[PDB]
Amino acid sequence: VNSFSGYLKLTDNVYIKNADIVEEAKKVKPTVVVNAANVYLKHGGGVAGALNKATNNAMQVESDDYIATNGPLKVGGSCVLSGHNLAKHCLHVVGPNVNKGEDIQLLKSAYENFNQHEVLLAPLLSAGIFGADPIHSLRVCVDTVRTNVYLAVFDKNLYDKLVSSFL
Numbered sequence: 781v782n783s784f785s786g787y788l789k790l791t792d793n794v795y796i797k798n799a800d801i802v803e804e805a806k807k808v809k810p811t812v813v814v815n816a817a818n819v820y821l822k823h824g825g826g827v828a829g830a831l832n833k834a835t836n837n838a839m840q841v842e843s844d845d846y847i848a849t850n851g852p853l854k855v856g857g858s859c860v861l862s863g864h865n866l867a868k869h870c871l872h873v874v875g876p877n878v879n880k881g882e883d884i885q886l887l888k889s890a891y892e893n894f895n896q897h898e899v900l901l902a903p904l905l906s907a908g909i910f911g912a913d914p915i916h917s918l919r920v921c922v923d924t925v926r927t928n929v930y931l932a933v934f935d936k937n938l939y940d941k942l943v944s945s946f947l
């Protein structure tokens with residue numbers, strides 16, 4: 781039993797809800813919130829910009845130190861950093877950006893990072909400003925993640941389409 785509330789159950793292990801991931805994190809304080817990161821951990825916009833703003837830029841400060849030490853992530857890769865005021869940990873996951881021409885097959889590799897954590901709050905990877913079809917992202921999620929994932933879909937219109945078309 782966990783504190784996630786109001787989710788629709790898509791599968792044994794995948795759940796979905798129309799919610800702002802920022803507001804959801806402040807309420808649940810999950811062990812792991814997933815960020816829709818880029819390889820540079822530059823959290824300028826999208827989900828990443830929203831999460832970072834909610835941390836008063838502390839996420840960005842920590843991220844800049846991480847990059848200065850370790851260099852950029854790989855597309856499809858991830859790192860665990862602090863969750864600041866939003867969660868215990870933030871799993872920064874880099875899905876491919878279609879608006880950068882990156883291979884959508886890398887989306888499955890990106891979701892595989894979720895399997896290292898028993899429970900996560902997460903967005904649909906590669907959706908939004910990353911350019912991928914969110915219906916495809918939800919499918920890859922369900923077919924790749926085996927741990928318990930609570931998806932927040934910010935757009936109510938997108939949420940209803942994801943649910944109504946979910947196979």
Ligand SMILES: O=C(O)C[C@H](NC(=O)c1ncnc2[nH]ccc12)c1ccc(Cl)cc1
Pocket residue numbers: 800801802816825826827830875903904905906907908909910932933934935938
């Ligand atoms: O679920 C959605 O609609 C799409 C989602 N976007 C957000 O979560 C979002 N975007 C902008 N401002 C925001 N403020 C609070 C949340 C939020 C998204 C998913 C993957 C990527 Cl790669 C990029 C964006």
